[PDB]
């Protein structure tokens, strides 16, 4: 009587692939040591029939690479390198077309959201503090993006094939970004409770949820208040290279010269599709490899980016 088994490919360097039969009655960890798949740690799970034909990255339990990981990736997650390298096995099969002067990604593995993230970052005066992360970013700006995309999946804790959210991904990435002197002061006014000032730094200084308009936030936006009533919140002061304004996808107008770039989202919360809109001499809509130009635009938008240096309001 034969043992239940599956054929999988194995690799310790993403170049060389060895065929392996895996025993179904033992975790991968028992058989190969620390093992990773599609950006997931599978060291402690048993083989599954659906894993047949997959490539797995094995990475011995060394903990010398733990020093490497810290210094080069700014992470103390022992699973990070494995997750990163198993992802890299996929992202190296992704194509990266140069479209309207930027690096984008050809549709595969639900990577539309990563395409938006990649497209957007290239237009921001932003930079990353983690050396390997920055170098990967650099290379992706020159057209060689497989590594950056794998790190993005890895820092965001996503697997290859997984639907995703640009704003959520940006929040993970920007933790590693050069935002140490980004600064935001907001004032909230409630008739009942009164007036309160809030000072933010880092990610929270450049990212906002509730409106797509940088004008609305300066002129005031309605927000619910502790007391239950609706109160007004507006931008007192902003020191940063850029801002990212987000909101649930709504029909929205983009006018050349009033923004940097933005993400269109069609569909619903359960399943949707991202494309990216940037402004050169005219509006470019980038849908992976496919490009459309247009002098104006209207559609479902959920993040809009703007260039910034210093702002001071003219309200009390």
């Amino acid at each position: 009587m034969e043992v239940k088994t599956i054929k999988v490919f194995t690799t310790v360097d993403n170049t060389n692939l060895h065929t392996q039969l895996v025993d179904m009655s033992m975790t991968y960890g028992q058989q190969f040591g620390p093992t990773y798949l599609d950006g997931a740690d599978v060291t402690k799970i048993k083989p599954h029939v659906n894993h047949e034909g997959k490539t797995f990255f094995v990475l011995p339990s060394d903990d010398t690479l733990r020093s490497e990981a810290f210094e080069y990736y700014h992470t103390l997650d022992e699973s990070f390198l494995g997750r990163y390298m198993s992802a890299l096995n996929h992202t190296k099969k992704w194509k990266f077309p140069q479209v309207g002067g930027l690096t984008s990604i050809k549709w595969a593995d639900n990577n539309c959201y990563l395409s938006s993230v990649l497209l957007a970052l290239q237009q921001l005066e932003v930079k990353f503090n983690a050396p390997a992360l920055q170098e990967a970013y650099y290379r992706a700006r020159a057209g060689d993006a497989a590594n950056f995309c794998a790190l993005i999946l890895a820092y965001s804790n996503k697997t290859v094939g997984e639907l995703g959210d640009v704003r959520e991904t940006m929040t993970h990435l920007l933790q590693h970004a050069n935002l140490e002197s980004a600064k935001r002061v907001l004032n909230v006014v409630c008739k009942h409770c009164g007036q309160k000032t809030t000072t933010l730094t880092g990610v929270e200084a450049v990212m906002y949820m509730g409106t797509l308009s940088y004008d609305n936030l300066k002129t005031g936006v309605s927000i619910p208040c502790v007391c239950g009533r609706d109160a007004t919140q507006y931008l007192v002061q902003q020191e940063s290279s850029f801002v990212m304004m987000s909101a649930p996808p709504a029909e929205y107008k983009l006018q050349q010269g009033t923004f940097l770039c933005a993400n269109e989202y069609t569909g619903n919360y359960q399943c949707g599709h991202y494309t990216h809109i940037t402004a050169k001499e005219t509006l470019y809509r980038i849908d992976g490899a496919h490009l459309t130009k247009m002098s104006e635009y209207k559609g479902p938008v959920t993040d809009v980016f703007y260039k910034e240096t210093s702002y001071t309001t003219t309200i009390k």
Binding site: N157, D165, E168, G202, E204, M209, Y269
Partner: protein
């Protein structure tokens, strides 16, 4: 041993009892359960820092009556 506030982005807030040594995954289950939203459909931040399912809540430095933010995830 700790009560915190989880606040939606659509205004609402709800109190959760947690230990610093439960995971973010666990707390997402508490929120999934109370608020009737699948776990795959939202994420949690504390003071701008995304919370990772695998991590202990303690790693984020949560205090009594602090506010964790719940964010709806677009599945693009």
């Amino acid at each position: 041993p700790l009560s915190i506030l989880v606040r939606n982005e659509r205004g609402h807030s709800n109190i959760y009892e947690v230990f610093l040594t439960q995971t973010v995954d666990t707390l997402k289950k508490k929120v999934s359960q109370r608020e009737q939203v699948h776990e795959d459909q939202f994420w949690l931040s504390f003071e701008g820092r995304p919370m990772e399912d695998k991590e202990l809540l303690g790693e984020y430095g949560l205090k009594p009556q602090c506010t964790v933010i719940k964010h709806l995830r677009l599945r693009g």
